[PDB]
Amino acid sequence: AIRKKLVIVGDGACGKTCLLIVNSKDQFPEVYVPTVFENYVADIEVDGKQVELALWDTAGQEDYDRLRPLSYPDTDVILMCFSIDSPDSLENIPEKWTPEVKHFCPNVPIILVGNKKDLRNDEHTRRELAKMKQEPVKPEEGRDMANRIGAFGYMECSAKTKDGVREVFEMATRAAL
C-alpha cells in the first residue's frame, strides 16, 4: 500500500473538521464537534492503486498561525478550503492560504475546495449575505480561483448532505500520486 499525506487548511469555521468526519463516518456531526479532528487514515483506491491517506486537520485561525507549520512537513497534497456561504473566506485563499502553503509546501499539489455547497441555494444564507452586498460564491469563481492559484483542480461539496465529499478525496488522492 502507498502512504500519502493530506493536510487541510482554510479559515476557521469554513467547514474543515466536519468534512473529514463525514468522510470517515458517513455522519455529519451535530452536537460534539471537535475543533480539530483526530488522526484517521483514509483508505482509497483510484485508477487501480490502493492508498492509505493520513489526514491532518488544522486550525486556521490566526491564533494558531505559529503552530500550524508543524503539520506541513512532507505533505503530498493540500486541501485548501473556503465556504460557499462566505465570500470572505474565499478571498483569504489568495490572501492568506496560498502564500503560507507555497512557503511551507512549495511543490505540493493544491486542491481548492468549496465547502457548504448546501448553502448556495439557502434562503437564509442568501438573505443574510444580502445584508452585505454579497451573495454566495459562484462555481465559476472557485474555478477561476483555482486557476489563479495553480491548483490541480477544484471541487465543491457539502458535508451536511455529503454531496461530493467522496469526490473531493478521490481527487486529492489522484493528485497525491
Binding site: 475543533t35 487514515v41 493520513a54
Partner: protein
C-alpha cells in the same frame, strides 16, 4: 524534577535516547494504533479492559501491549508530557462551547473540579501524548493535560513512519490500564491571546 522539552531540538535529542528497536510485529502494532485510535480505546473503555468480545481486536491489543511491555520499553528520566482533550472527556454532559469567547464557564468548571480534582483514575484506553507541547492537540483543544511521568514507566516513543502513521507529533504512548492522579485542575490564560483553557496536572502512578 522532570524534564520539559523547550523545542524540537530538545524534543529531538531526547528522542534519540529512547528505545527504538521494536520487532517488526512490534512496530506494526504501534503503527496500527496510530492510524486510528478510536477503535482501540473506544472499545476498551466501553468494555473495561475485557477483550473477549472482539477476537479481531484481542490479538490487536494483546499485541500492542507487548510492544509496550518490553523491558527496554521505558523512559529514562522523569519527563513531563502533554495531551489535549475535548470537553467531553469529563463526561457526556459537556461540550466545547464550555469555552465561549475565550472564557470558561465557571459554574461548569467548578462542578468539574469538585468532581475530578484530586481524583485517582484508571484508564482502560491507551494514552497518547507528546513530549513537545506545541505538537499534538494540546493547544487546539479545551482541556490541556500535563502528565508527569515517573522514570521507569513503560512506553513507546514515536516520531517516524515505521513507528507512527503521523510522524511529527513527537509522541509518547503509555500503556492501557495506566493509573494516574489528578493533582490540580485549573484555568490558565494563554500567553499573548486571551483565551482561557482548562489545565490539568496529573501524575502517573
Amino acid at each position: 524534577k522532570y524534564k520539559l522539552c523547550t523545542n524540537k531540538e530538545e524534543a529531538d535529542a531526547w528522542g534519540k535516547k529512547q528505545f527504538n528497536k521494536w520487532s517488526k510485529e512490534e512496530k506494526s502494532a504501534i503503527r496500527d494504533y496510530t492510524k486510528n485510535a478510536r477503535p482501540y480505546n473506544e472499545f476498551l473503555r466501553m468494555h473495561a479492559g475485557k477483550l473477549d468480545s472482539d477476537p479481531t481486536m484481542k490479538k490487536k491489543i494483546e499485541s500492542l501491549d507487548k510492544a509496550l511491555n518490553r523491558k527496554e520499553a521505558k523512559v529514562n528520566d522523569n519527563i513531563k508530557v502533554y495531551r489535549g482533550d475535548d470537553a467531553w472527556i469529563f463526561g457526556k454532559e459537556y461540550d466545547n462551547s464550555i469555552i465561549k469567547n475565550g472564557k470558561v464557564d465557571r459554574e461548569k468548571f467548578k462542578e468539574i473540579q469538585k468532581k475530578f480534582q484530586g481524583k485517582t483514575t484508571t484508564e482502560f484506553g491507551y494514552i497518547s501524548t507528546s513530549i513537545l507541547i506545541d505538537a499534538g492537540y494540546a493547544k487546539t483543544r479545551p482541556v490541556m493535560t500535563e502528565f508527569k511521568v515517573g522514570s521507569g514507566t513503560h512506553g513507546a516513543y514515536m516520531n517516524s513512519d515505521d513507528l507512527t502513521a503521523y510522524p511529527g507529533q513527537y509522541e509518547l504512548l503509555l500503556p492501557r490500564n495506566t493509573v494516574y492522579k489528578i493533582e490540580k485542575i485549573y484555568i490558565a490564560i494563554d500567553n499573548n491571546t486571551q483565551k482561557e483553557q482548562i489545565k490539568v496536572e496529573a501524575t502517573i502512578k
